[PDB]
Amino acid sequence: GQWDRLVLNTPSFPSNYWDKFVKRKVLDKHGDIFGRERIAELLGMDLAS
Amino acid sequence: KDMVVMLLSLLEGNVVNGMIARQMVDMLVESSSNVEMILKFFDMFLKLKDIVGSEAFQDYVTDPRGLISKKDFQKAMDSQKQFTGPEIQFLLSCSEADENEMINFEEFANRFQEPARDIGFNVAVLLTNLSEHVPHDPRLRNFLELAESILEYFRPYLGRIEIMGASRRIERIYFEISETNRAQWEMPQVKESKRQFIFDVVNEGGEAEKMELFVSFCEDTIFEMQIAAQISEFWGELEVQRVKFLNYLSRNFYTLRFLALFLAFAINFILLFYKVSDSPPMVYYFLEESTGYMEPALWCLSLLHTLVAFLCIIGYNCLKVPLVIFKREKELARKLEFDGLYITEQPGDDDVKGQWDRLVLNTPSFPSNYWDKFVKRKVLDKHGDIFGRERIAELLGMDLASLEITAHNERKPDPPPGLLTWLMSIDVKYQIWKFGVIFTDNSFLYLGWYMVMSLLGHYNNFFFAAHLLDIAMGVKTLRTILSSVTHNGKQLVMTVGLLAVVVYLYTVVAFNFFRKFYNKSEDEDEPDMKCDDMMTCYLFHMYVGVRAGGGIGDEIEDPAGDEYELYRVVFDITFFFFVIVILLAIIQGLIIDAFGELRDQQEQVKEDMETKCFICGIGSDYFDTTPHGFETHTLEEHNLANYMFFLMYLINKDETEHTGQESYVWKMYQERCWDFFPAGDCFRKQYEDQLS
Amino acid sequence: MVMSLLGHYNNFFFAAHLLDIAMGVKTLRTILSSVTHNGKQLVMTVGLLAVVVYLYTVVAFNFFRKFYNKSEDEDEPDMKCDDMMTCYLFHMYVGVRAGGGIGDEIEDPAGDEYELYRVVFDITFFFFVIVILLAIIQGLIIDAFGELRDQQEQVKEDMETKCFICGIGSDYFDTTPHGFETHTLEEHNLANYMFFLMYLINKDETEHTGQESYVWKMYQERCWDFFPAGDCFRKQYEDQLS
Ligand SMILES: Nc1ncnc2c1ncn2[C@@H]1O[C@H](COP(=O)(O)OP(=O)(O)OP(=O)(O)O)[C@@H](O)[C@H]1O
Ligand SMILES: Nc1ncnc2c1ncn2[C@@H]1O[C@H](COP(=O)(O)OP(=O)(O)OP(=O)(O)O)[C@@H](O)[C@H]1O
Ligand SMILES: Cn1c(=O)c2c(ncn2C)n(C)c1=O
Ligand SMILES: [Zn+2]
Ligand SMILES: [Zn+2]
């Protein structure tokens, strides 16, 4: 788990897996509870773009 | 809560799709608005506590005083996407805001936190009971959907068990499992004890009674560990510090047993650097090293190891010994009450346990650890008519007059505070019995040996080598591997005895005929006749003949060119086959099949656990006609953990407040009849047609 | 690769490359899986051997030390148990390897006032190390073979007594002639449940039929209730299908 922490921030996380929109589902699930901006920083994604 | 405990009562005894359950479902439909208000009140505050814990809330707060403005609180409630507008306004209204409009979010989170817990649990029980007894109803599951949050929160604490009620039908009982009980049941020690009990009961035993003795023991272990962890949660102050010290030892007893082993390795590693030389640094043993303080290190480690061993003995006296004395007091009081082992019958005159336990009966403090403190007064009321009340009084040491005096008003004075009172109030008889039990215990004897070797280590440090064997009892794997040998120990010892007999037969033959062949001497001046005496010749065979790979033929001289040559060939060859080959093969085979049997036993029990329910006895085949039905029936319907939490619920609950089914179970526990356990039946079976 | 490169520094490193055969062919992988199955117990057994031999080294160092003279000429004595380091190495090396035990190596106890104790010492060394402990090691290997064989028969017989998906046994499905085989590779075939997914994934969402859409929505939300557990088309319509 601690090693896998590195790859979350990267923009090319789901490189081989089918879902290329996993980050945008983690946001839509946990953003309310833990802050959309915080999830954006953890997943490296930018909200505006 | 009282209203719902009544509604629940009416539903008692009610079959699936019964009249009363359907009537209350019609009720709740008719009171839909009000019921929804109640459920959504509980939902509001149960969600509210979680939001108060959420990170978004704590980065919306600004004041270091831990207070949030009403507007800030409001926009926090909006951003959590969780409540609607009007209920956000309601929460703001409930906010104990000051004139500055600043809310203490912890206090507002927790004001309704405790008062609503019991009523919430009762509502959860009511909804679950109606759902399970009226399964096919469009109208109730609406309420269940609204109350999903309450059911989720009170799920961990809502235990259900099925029993066989008086009406000869399986009935489900819903009760409350407290937080402490659940936390204590999941603790590692209790879980290990659980798996041992399962292993023992599945290898052999009467199930229901053994479970109940497993529950009762566990309930006493729970007491002891809460007592031990209590501290972590003039003579008076020293007594307080003494209790703290002994509880600290008991709490981390295993760490002490682990450090003791570490010290044994450390010392024995120090012990490797010895040298024996005539010249002082008779003959003198001394360490050889370049450092210089190998030796003071050894001296400190010897004392520290001895101290740790003594501390472990104290830890054992305060952690595990009370359970042992409980399991003997418990069994004796049953043998005394239900079987009359000393009233009617008498100990079998070959069992040391009964005759030893005879001492403690006369003592006034017999049930010191067991729950029943009135066992003597029940043995009297049962057997006094048959065998004389006075005789039972003498056997149990109780006095008849003061027995009824305590039934009247009874005044007692507090004894003067003095160590002499402690010293003299000791019941020498009960203590003698207790220590006889303790020194009879295997683990205590092992720890005592460990201490004795540690002390003798100061007479000569090499005794610390014995302390290495602790590893066998330390780690699991060597305990399994050595359990292989100890499984067939009896056959191994008898095989070794058979070897001695056979070798003695060969010694007989060698002594009578082939004696010129046993000259283990090189020079002709000195002959070394090894079979001149049968003592020497038997020792010769038993020592070198068995150990030699070829057999006795390798050691003794050659038979070539002798008139007994052919007989010697037969003798040596049959020695090789019947001792070196077959008998050693038998010994090794006992070991191999011991491994096989132990592996078989573990797979044996384990596969039992996943093919049948522990309580029901019904197989997984029936319960899997529904998707994953067996798992649900395992840890929802008939869960052995829940049947323990029942007992701790009953014992705690006040007798006046026991419900009908609970009272029925309790009266049976006390009289020790186990018909309430569902055997060969289940709620699915009882109502198979209606539940469909 | 690293051994192959070091093979140019000294060609003998290519010898390590032979161990590849263990990972190459199936049979040696099974045979070595025997040892690796009970590797933990084997290592602990070897450790126990060291502890026991150390105990014997303690006893030998204290009492039976005159018997450890591995020297022929009287001018040069070769005291092997003068130091505990040397004496432990002596036992651990030659005592364990000797067939008889430590009694074969050390000198004879005949005609000595510790003779009887030496007899007990050597004999119990033979039983508790050469016989029992080596038997334990070999027994771990044998039962490893037995367990692996049992596991393969275990799974295999499962596969031919119950359907993988349904969970129902072959007894029900064989009330009809060869019914179990049909229910295996016609009705509930695990290969077909994979070809479904590759059918759904490929198919255009607009064109998913009702049942296909229902399955797809469940795959995506990751609920597995659509798999038939404990039921089959034969069971559902047993009366009508007859
Ligand atoms: N009445 C029963 N109560 C509990 N378990 C049962 C019962 N009947 C059968 N079982 C079997 O017991 C198994 C679980 O036992 P176990 O003690 O491992 O549960 P656990 O909570 O997972 O324990 P651990 O966490 O130690 O593994 C289940 O697989 C189930 O098949
Ligand atoms: N749902 C299922 N799907 C597939 N096979 C099943 C199922 N349930 C049970 N089986 C068992 O699986 C066995 C076939 O497995 P296997 O993979 O060998 O099939 P196969 O196509 O012959 O494979 P191979 O060609 O490698 O032997 C059958 O004998 C059958 O009893
Ligand atoms: C107090 N008490 C009881 O009264 C009891 C019991 N088990 C059965 N009964 C009746 N246990 C474990 C118990 O602690
Ligand atoms: Zn059950
Ligand atoms: Zn199938």
Secondary structure E strands in B147-221: 158-164, 170-176
Contacts of B645 (CB under 8 A, 6+ apart): B159, B175, B177, B181, B182, B185
User: Residue C70 Cα, ligand 2 centroid: separation in angstroms?
Assistant: 67
Phi, psi of B90 (to 5 degrees): -60, -45
**Among B185, B193, B632, B635, which is best to mutate for testing ligand 1, by the most ligand atoms less than 8 A from CB?**
B635
Which residues does chain B have within 8 Å of residue A35's beta carbon, measured at their own beta carbons? 55-56, 59
Using CA of residue C218, residue C219, residue C224, residue C226, what is the dihedral sign?
positive
| DSSP assignments along B94-125, one per residue | HS---TT-EEEHHHHHHTTTTTTHHHHHHHHH
| Interface contact C136-B272, CB threshold 8 A | no
Picking from B462, B477, B548, the nearest residue to C58 by CB comes out as B462
Residue B221 and residue B683 in contact, taking contact as beta carbons nearer than 8 Å: no
Print burial letters for B489-519: b (CB count within 10 Å at least 16), e (below 16): eeebeebeeebeebbeebbeebbeebeebbe
* Residue located via tokens 């069971």: C235
Minimal-distance CA residue of chain A relative to B51: A33
Binding-site residues from annotation of C for Ca(2+): 206
User: Residue B323 Cα, ligand 5 centroid: separation in angstroms?
Assistant: 51
- With vertex at residue B348, the alpha carbon angle to CA B347 and CA B354, rounded to the nearest 5 degrees, is 40
* Residue located via tokens 């129902």: C168
Q: Measured between alpha carbons, how far is B519 from B531 in angstroms, rounded to an integer? A: 8
Resolution in Å equals: 3.4
Copy the structure tokens of residue C113.
Answer: 């006032």
Residue B191: CB atoms within 10 A of its CB come to 11
Q: Measured between alpha carbons, how far is B574 from C139 in angstroms, rounded to an integer? A: 27
- In chain B, the N- to C-terminal Cα span, in Å, equals 33
Interface check C104 vs B, CB under 8 A: yes
Question: Which residues lie across from B619 on neighbouring strands?
Answer: B612
* Residue located via tokens 């290997």: C141
| Interface contact C55-B468, CB threshold 8 A | yes
HSE-CB of B48 using CA atoms within 13 angstroms: 25
Q: Measured between alpha carbons, how far is B202 from B272 in angstroms, rounded to an integer? A: 47
Chains in contact with chain C (at least 3 beta-carbon pairs closer than 8 A): B
| Interface contact B624-C138, CB threshold 8 A | no
Ligand 2 pocket, Cβ-based, cut-off 6 angstroms:
C 159-160, 163-165, 184, 188-190
**Nearest Cα to B675, choosing from B12, B172, B168, B14?**
B168
Q: How far is CA C29 from its chain centroid? A: 11
Which residue, judged by its Cα, is nearest atom 17 of ligand 1? B195
Residue B485 and residue B594 in contact, taking contact as beta carbons nearer than 8 Å: yes
| Interface contact B547-C82, CB threshold 8 A | no
Which residues does chain B have within 8 Å of residue A34's beta carbon, measured at their own beta carbons? 54-56
Scanning C73-209, the segments in alpha helix (DSSP H) are 84-90, 96-97, 102-105, 115-125, 132-159, 170-173, 179-182, 190-202
Mutation pick from B48, B50, B79 vs chain A, by most beta carbons of A within 10 Å, is B79
Copy the structure tokens of residue B499.
Answer: 């070897």
User: Residue B227 Cα, ligand 3 centroid: separation in angstroms?
Assistant: 18
| DSSP assignments along C112-128, one per residue | STTHHHHHHHHHHHIII
Residue B113 and residue B49 in contact, taking contact as beta carbons nearer than 8 Å: yes
| Interface contact C100-B542, CB threshold 8 A | no
Binding-site residues from annotation of C: 159-164, 184-190, 206
Interface check B59 vs A, CB under 8 A: yes
Using CA of residue B545, residue B551, residue B552, residue B555, what is the dihedral sign?
negative
User: Residue C185 Cα, ligand 2 centroid: separation in angstroms?
Assistant: 8
- Report which secondary-structure segment, H or E, holds B344: none
DSSP B273: S
Q: Is B338 helix (H, G, I), strand (E, B) or coil?
A: coil
**Nearest Cα to C53, choosing from C10, C84, C17, C26?**
C84
Residue C80 and residue C87 in contact, taking contact as beta carbons nearer than 8 Å: yes
Copy the structure tokens of residue B408.
Answer: 């009247």
Interface check B242 vs C, CB under 8 A: no
Residue C154 and residue C179 in contact, taking contact as beta carbons nearer than 8 Å: no
Using CA of residue B531, residue B533, residue B539, residue B542, what is the dihedral sign?
positive
Q: Measured between alpha carbons, how far is B390 from B380 in angstroms, rounded to an integer? A: 9
Phi, psi of B170 (to 5 degrees): -70, 130
Copy the structure tokens of residue B195.
Answer: 């798996």
Residue B92 and residue B69 in contact, taking contact as beta carbons nearer than 8 Å: no
**Among B209, B211, B216, which is best to mutate for testing ligand 3, by the most ligand atoms less than 8 A from CB?**
B216
HSE-CB of B511 using CA atoms within 13 angstroms: 16
Taking the C-alpha atoms of B517, B519, B523 and B525 in order, what is their torsion angle to the nearest 10 degrees?
-110
Q: Is C137 exposed, middle or buried (0-12, 13-18, 19+ CB in 10 A)?
A: middle
Q: Measured between alpha carbons, how far is B186 from B451 in angstroms, rounded to an integer? A: 33
DSSP C69: B
Q: Measured between alpha carbons, how far is C1 from C14 in angstroms, rounded to an integer? A: 11
Copy the structure tokens of residue B446.
Answer: 């092992």
Residue B575 and residue B509 in contact, taking contact as beta carbons nearer than 8 Å: no
HSE-CB of B542 using CA atoms within 13 angstroms: 20
The method recorded for this entry reads cryo-EM
DSSP C206: G
Q: Measured between alpha carbons, how far is B34 from B421 in angstroms, rounded to an integer? A: 65
Q: Measured between alpha carbons, how far is B271 from B89 in angstroms, rounded to an integer? A: 78
* Residue located via tokens 């390795």: B265
**Nearest Cα to B564, choosing from B599, B622, B512, B529?**
B512
| DSSP assignments along B560-573, one per residue | TTSTTHHHHHHHHH
Q: Measured between alpha carbons, how far is B251 from B230 in angstroms, rounded to an integer? A: 10
Scanning B513-639, the segments in alpha helix (DSSP H) are 534-540, 546-547, 552-555, 565-575, 582-609, 620-623, 629-632
Interface check B81 vs A, CB under 8 A: yes
Output the CA–CA distances (angstroms, integers) from residue B230 to B243, B316, C52, in the order listed: 10, 18, 42
Output the CA–CA distances (angstroms, integers) from residue B147 to B24, B186, B690, in the order listed: 17, 28, 26
**Nearest Cα to B67, choosing from B47, B88, B56, B52?**
B52
- Report which secondary-structure segment, H or E, holds B276: strand B274-277
Copy the structure tokens of residue B501.
Answer: 């007999």
Contacts of B79 (CB under 8 A, 6+ apart): A32, B56, B60
User: Residue B651 Cα, ligand 3 centroid: separation in angstroms?
Assistant: 6
Q: Are strands B170-176 and B67-69 parallel, antiparallel or unpaired?
A: unpaired
Using CA of residue B366, residue B368, residue B371, residue B377, what is the dihedral sign?
positive
Q: Measured between alpha carbons, how far is C233 from B326 in angstroms, rounded to an integer? A: 58
Task: Considering only CA atoms, give the Rg of chain C.
Answer: 33
| Interface contact C132-B485, CB threshold 8 A | yes
Q: Measured between alpha carbons, how far is A29 from C131 in angstroms, rounded to an integer? A: 65
HSE-CB of C50 using CA atoms within 13 angstroms: 11
Phi, psi of B619 (to 5 degrees): -80, 165
Contacts of B564 (CB under 8 A, 6+ apart): B513, B514
